[PDB]
Design a protein around this ligand. Structure first.
Ligand SMILES: CNC(=O)c1cccc2cc[nH]c12
Ligand SMILES: [Zn+2]
Length: 140
């Protein structure tokens, strides 16, 4: 589990969004596994605006923050999960590291801020849904 809190937006894994998130929906893309909802209170997080390929991610299933190299966001074939059938996931970044389904929402950060959240995993890879292309998160 986990979320990004930037301005009056909450960024969550689409598959973990709550009734409240859907009632207060701003934007969602099933192909990216992202949903953004509106918040009353201001968040503290800064989104990275960069093409960094090194960062650190939180892995709840290890209670550990791991430094990783990761690929640039791309379209990747993702095997079926409990929430999605096997399909191509867009804006996805891969790193060699430990992920379990419950690790989704773990933040990947670089020197510039939040890069994305854990979305996919298994086979010793972790997949992060990029948010850095979502420029509108920084305003309104
Ligand atoms: C929607 N798919 C998931 O819940 C998922 C997310 C992160 C890691 C793994 C490993 C297998 N499935 C995973
Ligand atoms: Zn960066």
């Amino acid at each position: 589990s986990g979320a990004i809190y930037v301005g009056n937006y909450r960024v969550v894994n689409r598959h973990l969004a709550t009734h409240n998130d859907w009632a207060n929906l701003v934007w969602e893309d099933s192909s990216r596994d992202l949903l953004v909802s509106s918040t009353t209170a201001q968040g503290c997080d800064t989104i990275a605006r960069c093409d960094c390929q090194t960062g650190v991610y939180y892995c709840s299933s290890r209670r550990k923050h791991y430094p990783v190299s990761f690929s640039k966001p791309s379209l990747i074939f993702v095997e079926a999960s409990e929430y999605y059938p096997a399909r191509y996931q867009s804006h996805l970044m891969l790193a060699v590291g430990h992920s379990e389904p419950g690790d989704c929402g773990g933040i990947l950060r670089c020197q510039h801020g939040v890069v994305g959240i854990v979305s996919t995993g298994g086979n010793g890879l972790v997949g992060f849904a990029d948010v850095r292309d979502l420029l509108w998160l920084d305003e309104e």
